[PDB]
Amino acid sequence: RDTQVMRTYHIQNREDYHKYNRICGDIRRLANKLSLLPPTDPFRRKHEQLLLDKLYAMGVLTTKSKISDLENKVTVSAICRRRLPVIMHRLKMAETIQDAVKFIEQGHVRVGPNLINDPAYLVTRNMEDYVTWVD
Amino acid sequence: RDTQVMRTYHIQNREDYHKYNRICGDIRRLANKLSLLPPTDPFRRKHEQLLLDKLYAMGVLTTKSKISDLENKVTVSAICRRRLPVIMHRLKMAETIQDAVKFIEQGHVRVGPNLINDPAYLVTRNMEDYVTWV
Amino acid sequence: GPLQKAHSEISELYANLVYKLDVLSSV
Amino acid sequence: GPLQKAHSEISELYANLVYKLDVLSSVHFVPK
Hints:
The complex is a heterotetramer, with two copies of chain A and two copies of chain C. Chain A is mainly α and 135 residues long. Chain A has one domain. Chain A is 53% helix and 6% strand. A three-stranded antiparallel beta sheet of chain A has the order 2-1-3, with no helix packed on it. The longest helix of chain A has 22 residues. The radius of gyration of chain A is 17 Å and the shape is elongated. Chain A starts with a helix and ends with a strand. With 27 residues, chain C is mainly α. Chain C has one domain. Chain C is built from one helix and no strands. Chains in contact: A-B, A-C, A-D, B-C, B-D, C-D. Chains A and C meet through helix 2 and helix 3 of A and helix 1 of C. Chain A: Required for the early cleavages at sites A0, A1 and A2 during 18S ribosomal pre-RNA processing. Chain A: It is found in: Nucleus, Nucleolus. Chain A: GO terms for molecular function: RNA folding chaperone; rRNA binding; snoRNA binding. Chain A: Component of a heterotrimeric complex containing IMP3, IMP4 and MPP10. Interacts with MPP10. Component of the ribosomal small subunit (SSU) processome composed of at least 40 protein subunits and snoRNA U3. Chain D: Belongs to the MPP10 family.
C-alpha cells in the first residue's frame, strides 16, 4: 500500500506516508462526529462547510464535495499530489518527479516569496500558481 | 481603544477589534505558558519557534523577534495592518483606506488567485506580493 | 452540557487538523 | 510524564490560534 504510494510519488521517508494516513483518519473521524450531531444544530452545517472549504484550500479536494464524498476522495494519494515535486512535474517544470526533488533540494525553486528546499512542502491552492525558479 | 482603532483603520464593526484583541491575548497567554516549561525542554523550543514562524508568516511580526518581544510587537494594530484595505494603502494602490474599501467591495481587487470583496480579509506574508487589479 | 461538550470536541479536532496541515505547507 | 498536562495545554492553545488566524485569511472557493 505504502511502498506503491511511496514509489509513485518518489517519497523516501516511510514516515511521510504515516502522517498523511493519520490525517486521512483525522478527517474521517471529524466527519463522523459532525454527522452525529443533531441535524437541527446550526454548528453542524457550519463546521461541515469549514472542513470542506479547508480541504479545497489545500487542494486535497479538487472537485465539489459533500461530507459523504470524503471517504472516496480523501486519500493519502490526494495529499501526495500536493507535494512540491509532484506539483512541479504536473506543471511540466520538471521532466520527472525525481528531477524535481533534485531541483528543490539544491535551492532552485521558490513558492510565493520563499525558497523551498524541502520536497515534502505541500503546495496549497493559493500557492500553486506561484512556483518559480530562483534563476 | 476600540473606537480609535476602528477609526484609524476604517473598520465598521465593533467585533473585529475584539477578535484581534482576544487573539493578542491568546498569544500572550501562550508565550507565558511556554516560558514556564524548563528552558532545556525541546517541546518548548519547538513551540516557541512555531509560534514565532506563524506570526512572521502572518506578517503580524514584521521583524526578527523573540518571545520576549511578543508583549510589545503583537498589538491589535499590528493585526489591523494586515487587512486588505490597509495593505493596499501601504502599497499605494489606493490614496486612502476608504478608497481601498470601495475598490475591494466593488470587486476590483484580487489576492493571489481569488477575488476578495471583504475588507476584513487578512493578507498573509505569502500573499502580500500578489494583490492585483481585476 | 452534552451539546457544548460535543461542540468542543469537534472544535479541538478541527483546530488540530488545521494545525497539522499548516505545518506541512509552511517554511 | 510530569510535563504532559502543560504540554497538552500548549498544543491545544496553539492549534486554536492557528485556526483563528486561518479563518481571518479565508476565501469562499468551490471547485468544479
